[PDB]
Amino acid sequence: SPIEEQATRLLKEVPLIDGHNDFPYMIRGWFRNDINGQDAHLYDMPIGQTDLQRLQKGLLGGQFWSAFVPCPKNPDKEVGSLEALRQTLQQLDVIHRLIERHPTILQFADSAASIWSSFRAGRVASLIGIEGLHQIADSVSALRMLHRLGVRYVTLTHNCHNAFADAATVSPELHGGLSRKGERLIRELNRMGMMIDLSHTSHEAQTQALRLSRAPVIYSHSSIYSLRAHARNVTDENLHLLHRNRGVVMICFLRELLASEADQATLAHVIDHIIYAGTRIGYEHVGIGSDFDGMLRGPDGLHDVSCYPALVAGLLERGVSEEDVKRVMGLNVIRVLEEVERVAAELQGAGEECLCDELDEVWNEDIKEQLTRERERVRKL
Amino acid sequence: SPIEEQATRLLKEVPLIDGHNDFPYMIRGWFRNDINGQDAHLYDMPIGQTDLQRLQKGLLGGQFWSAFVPCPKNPDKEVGSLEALRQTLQQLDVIHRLIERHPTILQFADSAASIWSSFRAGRVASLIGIEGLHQIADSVSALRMLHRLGVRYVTLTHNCHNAFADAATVSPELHGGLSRKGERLIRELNRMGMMIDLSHTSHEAQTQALRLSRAPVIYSHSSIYSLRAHARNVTDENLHLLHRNRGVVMICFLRELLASEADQATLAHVIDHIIYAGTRIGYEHVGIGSDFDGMLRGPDGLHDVSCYPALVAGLLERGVSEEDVKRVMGLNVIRVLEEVERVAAELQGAGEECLCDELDEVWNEDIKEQLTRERERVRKL
Ligand SMILES: [Cl-]
Ligand SMILES: [Cl-]
Ligand SMILES: [Co+2]
Ligand SMILES: [Co+2]
Ligand SMILES: [Co+2]
Ligand SMILES: [Co+2]
């Protein structure tokens, strides 16, 4: 088919960069992060919507691999929070090991330049994002170390309220948007060059984050509210504030977010959602955020990661121009990551002060007096 | 003085690389890891044995900055262990921020090549080590992420027994050396290219680690047992096994480890300890491991980080050859780090399997059956 040829050509010209895939958590469920001698299974998985053979088949250019861990449910609240931090390092560890053991398919990327160089080599550009600020255990230091480990976006919440922001699916509201800590964290995320992700966050938390952020943000996996009313979807108000923010809404393949009846959801609905956003806020602010392996079943026509060429062909069939399809595929999310890193470079270049942790006093006054007396003794010499 | 001129020349030819300095924990005690607008104090500290002015004055070429956190003392044992992991990320964060905010003085290094390039630029080569396996919270995944954050050695214990090995100063013995986990961790540390540090570990744990390790190890800050009998010092038996291992004993400035009467300890004693080891196991297996800022007061003549030229001159005055002084200064610890990285490269190159964490089952059989049924439905299409 000529349109299938056109879609294949576009997929080779520019990388289709998917906003969210939970294949690392599927590895934790199935293999329990032990992938030694599991290559036959990693290429041909007995479960899920992602494996390395189907990943090649769909001609995907890049991927933000989710380092999701569940919201803490332990009665001991400090233990649950600290457990999430240890589990986060396990998920970052298995993502890095997945990339390093399969260098011909996957190549790690943390920037616009690293995405392109990965794509030129014929590799899937493998980026990392964490799904919720519960994962950092209330530690801004830990968050900066997650950035150093290769994390390039942070979803502000998952399906639980935290110290910083409100989740969409939890009632009642705790903060009614962002907290005072949350507002201060927006500045720190902009300063360090961490891309803000507004999926899973409440409508009010989106509105506040979109006005406050000095860098463009993303929705790593969210759909349109006007087409399908859901707490997880993006309202017209927040779509306009995303336009001002210069951000990108990466459209989700979750069936509950595309249609009221789940079994009726399709590839055509995903394209309706992409076209709606592209029509109203322009095609430079729309992306693709599948949430593959964050669901049991996908829409009809988008059952797994091999189905991306059908989406590219489907967009072209509707009359979306090649240039606008390339934008939706990956150029938009590359631009946001590029602008996030430029905003960080200019804020760091202007000597903006970093957000410190709230640390307890480890020494009493007796320890400090011994230390100051000792220093002055050395000054006398 | 001609010998002072000779010492100054040697300090400019090769980097004096100190094995252990606890200045990052002093920043946590004094500033509480908030160094914003504290440059006047960071250059001229009101306490302690390390600041950025005195660091320049002593002509130090490199430094393994300690990311030490205390052994957990909480009644809730899981919380204490998980707390140590969060505190470790705070200490790694402040070390990286200390280096990044002072690029003219400090430059981060994680290899032999990066140490040299830092030294050629006129910077103190800033490496990182953690003081105890309590810091990883029983997670080998976390340990691999600490390596990715820039940690290049791990002290197996501090002053507490852990799951892997026995500390020197705690009785009774738990494992009587290394545990079965510890033995398995030695292989993993060799595979990843993490330098093993045997300071603070029991005599039996040293003996076992020295026989088992495929890469050379270090004592980041330990002294000689025959000159001064202490649990923390290295016995003749372990000095010989260190020679076979090809490791380096980095001599400590702790007064309790140099003499029975603490106030009688001196620079001359440190040189006696260096010469003892250099005479018996050769000068290619001896180093300098001050433990500055891990003590209130230092020996007479080694009161702070500005006193390194006195040590270099003192070694030359005793009749230690220029070539052997250069070895003790830094060439030996560079060689160990170089060999540790080569052993890792050859073990990784031979496809040796990594040590995985013990992970719990997150899915029941009902979840797994839904996933396998769902996959087979997609295969039918
Ligand atoms: Cl380009
Ligand atoms: Cl050289
Ligand atoms: Co997810
Ligand atoms: Co999600
Ligand atoms: Co220490
Ligand atoms: Co110590």
PDB file of N, CA, C and O in Angstrom, chain A residues 195-246:
ATOM      1  N   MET A 195      11.921  17.103  33.393  1.00  0.00           N
ATOM      2  CA  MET A 195      10.678  17.361  32.670  1.00  0.00           C
ATOM      3  C   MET A 195       9.496  17.023  33.578  1.00  0.00           C
ATOM      4  O   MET A 195       9.447  15.942  34.156  1.00  0.00           O
ATOM      5  N   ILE A 196       8.564  17.962  33.727  1.00  0.00           N
ATOM      6  CA  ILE A 196       7.381  17.744  34.563  1.00  0.00           C
ATOM      7  C   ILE A 196       6.353  16.944  33.762  1.00  0.00           C
ATOM      8  O   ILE A 196       6.110  17.239  32.589  1.00  0.00           O
ATOM      9  N   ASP A 197       5.774  15.928  34.401  1.00  0.00           N
ATOM     10  CA  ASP A 197       4.725  15.103  33.802  1.00  0.00           C
ATOM     11  C   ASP A 197       3.442  15.273  34.627  1.00  0.00           C
ATOM     12  O   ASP A 197       3.450  15.070  35.842  1.00  0.00           O
ATOM     13  N   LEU A 198       2.354  15.652  33.954  1.00  0.00           N
ATOM     14  CA  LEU A 198       1.077  15.966  34.609  1.00  0.00           C
ATOM     15  C   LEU A 198      -0.004  14.886  34.453  1.00  0.00           C
ATOM     16  O   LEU A 198      -1.159  15.113  34.829  1.00  0.00           O
ATOM     17  N   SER A 199       0.356  13.719  33.912  1.00  0.00           N
ATOM     18  CA  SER A 199      -0.545  12.560  33.922  1.00  0.00           C
ATOM     19  C   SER A 199      -0.766  12.102  35.363  1.00  0.00           C
ATOM     20  O   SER A 199       0.090  12.313  36.218  1.00  0.00           O
ATOM     21  N   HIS A 200      -1.942  11.536  35.633  1.00  0.00           N
ATOM     22  CA  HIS A 200      -2.349  11.073  36.976  1.00  0.00           C
ATOM     23  C   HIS A 200      -2.615  12.171  38.031  1.00  0.00           C
ATOM     24  O   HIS A 200      -3.124  11.856  39.108  1.00  0.00           O
ATOM     25  N   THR A 201      -2.307  13.435  37.728  1.00  0.00           N
ATOM     26  CA  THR A 201      -2.499  14.541  38.670  1.00  0.00           C
ATOM     27  C   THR A 201      -3.901  15.121  38.506  1.00  0.00           C
ATOM     28  O   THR A 201      -4.503  15.005  37.435  1.00  0.00           O
ATOM     29  N   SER A 202      -4.405  15.759  39.561  1.00  0.00           N
ATOM     30  CA  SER A 202      -5.740  16.370  39.543  1.00  0.00           C
ATOM     31  C   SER A 202      -5.798  17.569  38.595  1.00  0.00           C
ATOM     32  O   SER A 202      -4.769  18.178  38.294  1.00  0.00           O
ATOM     33  N   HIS A 203      -7.008  17.905  38.143  1.00  0.00           N
ATOM     34  CA  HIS A 203      -7.224  19.026  37.206  1.00  0.00           C
ATOM     35  C   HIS A 203      -6.698  20.353  37.762  1.00  0.00           C
ATOM     36  O   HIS A 203      -6.163  21.175  37.016  1.00  0.00           O
ATOM     37  N   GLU A 204      -6.865  20.549  39.071  1.00  0.00           N
ATOM     38  CA  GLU A 204      -6.387  21.753  39.759  1.00  0.00           C
ATOM     39  C   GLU A 204      -4.858  21.779  39.881  1.00  0.00           C
ATOM     40  O   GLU A 204      -4.248  22.844  39.766  1.00  0.00           O
ATOM     41  N   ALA A 205      -4.253  20.614  40.117  1.00  0.00           N
ATOM     42  CA  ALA A 205      -2.788  20.478  40.152  1.00  0.00           C
ATOM     43  C   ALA A 205      -2.146  20.749  38.789  1.00  0.00           C
ATOM     44  O   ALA A 205      -1.031  21.271  38.720  1.00  0.00           O
ATOM     45  N   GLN A 206      -2.854  20.389  37.718  1.00  0.00           N
ATOM     46  CA  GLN A 206      -2.420  20.681  36.348  1.00  0.00           C
ATOM     47  C   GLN A 206      -2.445  22.183  36.081  1.00  0.00           C
ATOM     48  O   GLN A 206      -1.447  22.755  35.641  1.00  0.00           O
ATOM     49  N   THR A 207      -3.590  22.806  36.362  1.00  0.00           N
ATOM     50  CA  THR A 207      -3.784  24.256  36.207  1.00  0.00           C
ATOM     51  C   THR A 207      -2.696  25.074  36.911  1.00  0.00           C
ATOM     52  O   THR A 207      -2.153  26.014  36.330  1.00  0.00           O
ATOM     53  N   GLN A 208      -2.387  24.706  38.153  1.00  0.00           N
ATOM     54  CA  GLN A 208      -1.370  25.407  38.949  1.00  0.00           C
ATOM     55  C   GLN A 208       0.050  25.164  38.434  1.00  0.00           C
ATOM     56  O   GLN A 208       0.845  26.102  38.346  1.00  0.00           O
ATOM     57  N   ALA A 209       0.361  23.910  38.104  1.00  0.00           N
ATOM     58  CA  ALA A 209       1.671  23.548  37.547  1.00  0.00           C
ATOM     59  C   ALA A 209       1.925  24.187  36.178  1.00  0.00           C
ATOM     60  O   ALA A 209       3.045  24.615  35.892  1.00  0.00           O
ATOM     61  N   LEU A 210       0.885  24.251  35.346  1.00  0.00           N
ATOM     62  CA  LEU A 210       0.982  24.855  34.009  1.00  0.00           C
ATOM     63  C   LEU A 210       1.233  26.368  34.044  1.00  0.00           C
ATOM     64  O   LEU A 210       1.957  26.892  33.196  1.00  0.00           O
ATOM     65  N   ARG A 211       0.632  27.059  35.013  1.00  0.00           N
ATOM     66  CA  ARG A 211       0.875  28.495  35.208  1.00  0.00           C
ATOM     67  C   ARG A 211       2.248  28.778  35.828  1.00  0.00           C
ATOM     68  O   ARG A 211       2.927  29.725  35.426  1.00  0.00           O
ATOM     69  N   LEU A 212       2.649  27.955  36.797  1.00  0.00           N
ATOM     70  CA  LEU A 212       3.894  28.169  37.553  1.00  0.00           C
ATOM     71  C   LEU A 212       5.183  27.780  36.826  1.00  0.00           C
ATOM     72  O   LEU A 212       6.207  28.443  37.005  1.00  0.00           O
ATOM     73  N   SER A 213       5.143  26.708  36.035  1.00  0.00           N
ATOM     74  CA  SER A 213       6.357  26.151  35.425  1.00  0.00           C
ATOM     75  C   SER A 213       7.003  27.105  34.418  1.00  0.00           C
ATOM     76  O   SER A 213       6.319  27.669  33.563  1.00  0.00           O
ATOM     77  N   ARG A 214       8.320  27.275  34.540  1.00  0.00           N
ATOM     78  CA  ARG A 214       9.105  28.095  33.611  1.00  0.00           C
ATOM     79  C   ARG A 214       9.587  27.317  32.382  1.00  0.00           C
ATOM     80  O   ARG A 214      10.044  27.925  31.411  1.00  0.00           O
ATOM     81  N   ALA A 215       9.494  25.986  32.434  1.00  0.00           N
ATOM     82  CA  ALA A 215       9.809  25.120  31.298  1.00  0.00           C
ATOM     83  C   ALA A 215       8.540  24.403  30.834  1.00  0.00           C
ATOM     84  O   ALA A 215       7.599  24.248  31.619  1.00  0.00           O
ATOM     85  N   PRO A 216       8.503  23.964  29.558  1.00  0.00           N
ATOM     86  CA  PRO A 216       7.348  23.196  29.089  1.00  0.00           C
ATOM     87  C   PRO A 216       7.253  21.818  29.742  1.00  0.00           C
ATOM     88  O   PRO A 216       8.279  21.182  29.998  1.00  0.00           O
ATOM     89  N   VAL A 217       6.024  21.382  30.001  1.00  0.00           N
ATOM     90  CA  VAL A 217       5.755  20.113  30.682  1.00  0.00           C
ATOM     91  C   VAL A 217       5.191  19.112  29.679  1.00  0.00           C
ATOM     92  O   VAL A 217       5.034  19.433  28.499  1.00  0.00           O
ATOM     93  N   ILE A 218       4.907  17.900  30.146  1.00  0.00           N
ATOM     94  CA  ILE A 218       4.222  16.902  29.327  1.00  0.00           C
ATOM     95  C   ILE A 218       3.073  16.247  30.082  1.00  0.00           C
ATOM     96  O   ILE A 218       2.950  16.375  31.302  1.00  0.00           O
ATOM     97  N   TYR A 219       2.219  15.580  29.318  1.00  0.00           N
ATOM     98  CA  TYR A 219       1.332  14.549  29.826  1.00  0.00           C
ATOM     99  C   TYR A 219       1.863  13.284  29.182  1.00  0.00           C
ATOM    100  O   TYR A 219       1.673  13.088  27.985  1.00  0.00           O
ATOM    101  N   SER A 220       2.546  12.445  29.956  1.00  0.00           N
ATOM    102  CA  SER A 220       3.202  11.247  29.417  1.00  0.00           C
ATOM    103  C   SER A 220       2.208  10.207  28.906  1.00  0.00           C
ATOM    104  O   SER A 220       2.520   9.468  27.976  1.00  0.00           O
ATOM    105  N   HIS A 221       1.032  10.142  29.531  1.00  0.00           N
ATOM    106  CA  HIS A 221      -0.062   9.294  29.050  1.00  0.00           C
ATOM    107  C   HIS A 221      -1.421   9.771  29.580  1.00  0.00           C
ATOM    108  O   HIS A 221      -1.893   9.328  30.628  1.00  0.00           O
ATOM    109  N   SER A 222      -2.027  10.702  28.842  1.00  0.00           N
ATOM    110  CA  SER A 222      -3.363  11.224  29.144  1.00  0.00           C
ATOM    111  C   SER A 222      -4.107  11.539  27.857  1.00  0.00           C
ATOM    112  O   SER A 222      -3.489  11.873  26.845  1.00  0.00           O
ATOM    113  N   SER A 223      -5.433  11.452  27.916  1.00  0.00           N
ATOM    114  CA  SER A 223      -6.292  11.699  26.761  1.00  0.00           C
ATOM    115  C   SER A 223      -7.179  12.934  26.996  1.00  0.00           C
ATOM    116  O   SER A 223      -7.028  13.639  27.993  1.00  0.00           O
ATOM    117  N   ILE A 224      -8.073  13.197  26.050  1.00  0.00           N
ATOM    118  CA  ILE A 224      -8.907  14.398  26.000  1.00  0.00           C
ATOM    119  C   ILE A 224     -10.223  14.222  26.761  1.00  0.00           C
ATOM    120  O   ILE A 224     -10.932  13.227  26.583  1.00  0.00           O
ATOM    121  N   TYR A 225     -10.545  15.217  27.587  1.00  0.00           N
ATOM    122  CA  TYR A 225     -11.735  15.199  28.442  1.00  0.00           C
ATOM    123  C   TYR A 225     -13.039  15.417  27.672  1.00  0.00           C
ATOM    124  O   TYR A 225     -14.041  14.764  27.961  1.00  0.00           O
ATOM    125  N   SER A 226     -13.034  16.360  26.730  1.00  0.00           N
ATOM    126  CA  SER A 226     -14.232  16.686  25.940  1.00  0.00           C
ATOM    127  C   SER A 226     -14.777  15.505  25.130  1.00  0.00           C
ATOM    128  O   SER A 226     -15.993  15.366  24.980  1.00  0.00           O
ATOM    129  N   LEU A 227     -13.879  14.668  24.614  1.00  0.00           N
ATOM    130  CA  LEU A 227     -14.265  13.446  23.898  1.00  0.00           C
ATOM    131  C   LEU A 227     -14.694  12.323  24.841  1.00  0.00           C
ATOM    132  O   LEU A 227     -15.592  11.546  24.512  1.00  0.00           O
ATOM    133  N   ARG A 228     -14.041  12.237  25.999  1.00  0.00           N
ATOM    134  CA  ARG A 228     -14.341  11.214  27.000  1.00  0.00           C
ATOM    135  C   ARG A 228     -14.049  11.773  28.393  1.00  0.00           C
ATOM    136  O   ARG A 228     -12.888  11.976  28.753  1.00  0.00           O
ATOM    137  N   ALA A 229     -15.108  12.021  29.165  1.00  0.00           N
ATOM    138  CA  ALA A 229     -14.984  12.634  30.489  1.00  0.00           C
ATOM    139  C   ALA A 229     -14.454  11.633  31.515  1.00  0.00           C
ATOM    140  O   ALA A 229     -15.103  10.626  31.805  1.00  0.00           O
ATOM    141  N   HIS A 230     -13.269  11.923  32.044  1.00  0.00           N
ATOM    142  CA  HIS A 230     -12.605  11.081  33.037  1.00  0.00           C
ATOM    143  C   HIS A 230     -11.642  11.959  33.841  1.00  0.00           C
ATOM    144  O   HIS A 230     -11.104  12.931  33.307  1.00  0.00           O
ATOM    145  N   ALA A 231     -11.429  11.623  35.113  1.00  0.00           N
ATOM    146  CA  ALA A 231     -10.504  12.375  35.984  1.00  0.00           C
ATOM    147  C   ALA A 231      -9.063  12.416  35.447  1.00  0.00           C
ATOM    148  O   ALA A 231      -8.350  13.403  35.633  1.00  0.00           O
ATOM    149  N   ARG A 232      -8.659  11.333  34.790  1.00  0.00           N
ATOM    150  CA  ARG A 232      -7.335  11.189  34.174  1.00  0.00           C
ATOM    151  C   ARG A 232      -7.117  11.990  32.881  1.00  0.00           C
ATOM    152  O   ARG A 232      -5.968  12.226  32.500  1.00  0.00           O
ATOM    153  N   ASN A 233      -8.196  12.391  32.209  1.00  0.00           N
ATOM    154  CA  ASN A 233      -8.101  13.124  30.937  1.00  0.00           C
ATOM    155  C   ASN A 233      -7.919  14.631  31.131  1.00  0.00           C
ATOM    156  O   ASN A 233      -8.178  15.163  32.209  1.00  0.00           O
ATOM    157  N   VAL A 234      -7.478  15.303  30.067  1.00  0.00           N
ATOM    158  CA  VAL A 234      -7.111  16.723  30.110  1.00  0.00           C
ATOM    159  C   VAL A 234      -8.286  17.588  29.650  1.00  0.00           C
ATOM    160  O   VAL A 234      -8.801  17.404  28.544  1.00  0.00           O
ATOM    161  N   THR A 235      -8.693  18.534  30.497  1.00  0.00           N
ATOM    162  CA  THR A 235      -9.784  19.461  30.181  1.00  0.00           C
ATOM    163  C   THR A 235      -9.344  20.497  29.149  1.00  0.00           C
ATOM    164  O   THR A 235      -8.146  20.717  28.953  1.00  0.00           O
ATOM    165  N   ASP A 236     -10.323  21.129  28.501  1.00  0.00           N
ATOM    166  CA  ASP A 236     -10.060  22.210  27.540  1.00  0.00           C
ATOM    167  C   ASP A 236      -9.271  23.354  28.185  1.00  0.00           C
ATOM    168  O   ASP A 236      -8.332  23.873  27.588  1.00  0.00           O
ATOM    169  N   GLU A 237      -9.637  23.718  29.413  1.00  0.00           N
ATOM    170  CA  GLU A 237      -8.915  24.743  30.174  1.00  0.00           C
ATOM    171  C   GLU A 237      -7.417  24.431  30.269  1.00  0.00           C
ATOM    172  O   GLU A 237      -6.583  25.279  29.951  1.00  0.00           O
ATOM    173  N   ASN A 238      -7.093  23.209  30.692  1.00  0.00           N
ATOM    174  CA  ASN A 238      -5.696  22.775  30.830  1.00  0.00           C
ATOM    175  C   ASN A 238      -4.987  22.536  29.489  1.00  0.00           C
ATOM    176  O   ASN A 238      -3.763  22.656  29.421  1.00  0.00           O
ATOM    177  N   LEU A 239      -5.743  22.197  28.441  1.00  0.00           N
ATOM    178  CA  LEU A 239      -5.192  22.129  27.078  1.00  0.00           C
ATOM    179  C   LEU A 239      -4.708  23.503  26.596  1.00  0.00           C
ATOM    180  O   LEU A 239      -3.645  23.600  25.979  1.00  0.00           O
ATOM    181  N   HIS A 240      -5.481  24.554  26.878  1.00  0.00           N
ATOM    182  CA  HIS A 240      -5.073  25.927  26.547  1.00  0.00           C
ATOM    183  C   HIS A 240      -3.867  26.390  27.368  1.00  0.00           C
ATOM    184  O   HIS A 240      -2.963  27.032  26.831  1.00  0.00           O
ATOM    185  N   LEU A 241      -3.862  26.079  28.662  1.00  0.00           N
ATOM    186  CA  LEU A 241      -2.719  26.400  29.526  1.00  0.00           C
ATOM    187  C   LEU A 241      -1.468  25.586  29.168  1.00  0.00           C
ATOM    188  O   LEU A 241      -0.348  26.046  29.397  1.00  0.00           O
ATOM    189  N   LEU A 242      -1.661  24.387  28.611  1.00  0.00           N
ATOM    190  CA  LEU A 242      -0.561  23.602  28.038  1.00  0.00           C
ATOM    191  C   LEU A 242       0.031  24.280  26.797  1.00  0.00           C
ATOM    192  O   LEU A 242       1.245  24.230  26.586  1.00  0.00           O
ATOM    193  N   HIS A 243      -0.827  24.896  25.981  1.00  0.00           N
ATOM    194  CA  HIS A 243      -0.387  25.673  24.814  1.00  0.00           C
ATOM    195  C   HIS A 243       0.495  26.864  25.209  1.00  0.00           C
ATOM    196  O   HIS A 243       1.544  27.084  24.599  1.00  0.00           O
ATOM    197  N   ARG A 244       0.057  27.629  26.211  1.00  0.00           N
ATOM    198  CA  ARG A 244       0.847  28.747  26.759  1.00  0.00           C
ATOM    199  C   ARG A 244       2.172  28.270  27.357  1.00  0.00           C
ATOM    200  O   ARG A 244       3.213  28.905  27.178  1.00  0.00           O
ATOM    201  N   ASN A 245       2.103  27.149  28.073  1.00  0.00           N
ATOM    202  CA  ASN A 245       3.270  26.479  28.660  1.00  0.00           C
ATOM    203  C   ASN A 245       4.270  25.940  27.612  1.00  0.00           C
ATOM    204  O   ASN A 245       5.449  25.757  27.922  1.00  0.00           O
ATOM    205  N   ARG A 246       3.790  25.701  26.388  1.00  0.00           N
ATOM    206  CA  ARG A 246       4.566  25.138  25.270  1.00  0.00           C
ATOM    207  C   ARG A 246       4.783  23.627  25.435  1.00  0.00           C
ATOM    208  O   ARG A 246       5.714  23.056  24.856  1.00  0.00           O
TER     209      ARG A 246
END
